[PDB]
Design an enzyme around this catalytic site. Sequence first.
Site, mmCIF file in Angstrom:
data_model
loop_
_atom_site.group_PDB
_atom_site.id
_atom_site.type_symbol
_atom_site.label_atom_id
_atom_site.label_comp_id
_atom_site.label_asym_id
_atom_site.label_seq_id
_atom_site.Cartn_x
_atom_site.Cartn_y
_atom_site.Cartn_z
ATOM 1 C CD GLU A 1 -2.646 12.003 24.607
ATOM 2 O OE1 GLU A 1 -2.502 12.950 25.348
ATOM 3 O OE2 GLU A 1 -3.580 11.935 23.665
ATOM 4 C CG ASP B 1 1.617 15.699 27.328
ATOM 5 O OD1 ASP B 1 2.028 16.670 26.616
ATOM 6 O OD2 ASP B 1 1.028 14.668 26.879
#
Length: 377
Positions: free
Chosen positions: A172, A194
């Site tokens: 990610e 995140d």
Amino acid sequence: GPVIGIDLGTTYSCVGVFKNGRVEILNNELGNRITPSYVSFVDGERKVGEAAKLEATLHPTQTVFDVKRLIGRKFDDQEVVKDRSLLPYEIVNNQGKPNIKVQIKDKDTTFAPEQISAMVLEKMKEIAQSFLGKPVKNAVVTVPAYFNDAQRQATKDAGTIAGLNIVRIINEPTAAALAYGLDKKEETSILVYDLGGGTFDVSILVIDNGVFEVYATAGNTHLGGEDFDQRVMDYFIKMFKKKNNIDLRTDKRAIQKLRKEVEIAKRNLSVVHSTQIEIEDIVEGHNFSETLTRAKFEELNDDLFRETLEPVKKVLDDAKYEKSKIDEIVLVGGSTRIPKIQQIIKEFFNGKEPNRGINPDEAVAYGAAIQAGIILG
Ligand SMILES: Nc1ncnc2c1nc(NCc1ccccc1Cl)n2[C@@H]1O[C@H](CO)[C@@H](O)[C@H]1O
């Protein structure tokens, strides 16, 4: 053939194609660019996405979600023991591994996590296929940087069940670096912050002459936008009881209607200072009508906002970095739109401005689609 990019998220997934030189993030049949990672097994029918999520209120044992928390893990892992106590669908021990048990026409049926994730990947694949007017057999799929080989292999196996060759698994943070087009030349140290619906991850990613490496990762598996909503719900449930002698928790439908309006009020308060939460007949003969300010929203959640800094200190300590050593702070997840989050990170980094996108919920899928285009040449 085509290669699509999929962000297989904890709470939602998102699919992107690279086509005529651009990434297109595709809408599902309901016109949304993100799909809740939910599968429901009610009344003989199987639903995937928002229609499944809507079954959770009346059919909580049959409505499967957050499977990313279980995939490739062992039943006796400390994190899985904690999730079994939080999740309302039955989790069983199949030879040391968590499986999901539900009923289809009253029959007990057991699924590996990868079998539920395959159903999400299958819906993402069908969105791609109808948009491209073509069979899709290949995908880039994202995983958290902390995923081990068993978690990555079970994600690949979900792909195989869904009829997708996962030609590349990328983490990610890398996906985010590709979406924001972080220059690949020379050396750059990036903090990827995140903050999603259910989970918080932070990574130090170093880019060195086109080679991406995550030097450290940390997070909080139970800290996201859904927690901020629950703090607001707890406040208004208490207020509604004080004023009206009605405890809305005694009606699951009342709770569902309030939760939808609270979610919307939070999102508004990322732009305005004051917003109205309105439900006609939240129970019969009683309306819900309240004002939430940004200042009360922040007061209700300020301890949770500040908790996001504990993982930041840990990755800086693990990497042996000074704050100054960070070149760029990149924000991923819709929850980073909260002004107070962006403020707290700025001030932790003794004044340095964080980079945020315009569509922070799609950045990871955007980067996966970019990685797909890079692999095709
Ligand atoms: N303006 C926002 N302010 C605060 N938090 C936000 C905001 N937008 C989102 N997300 C985007 C999103 C949500 C619903 C429909 C469409 C979209 Cl693209 N979040 C939060 O981001 C998480 C994953 O969407 C959720 O907890 C959500 O509530």
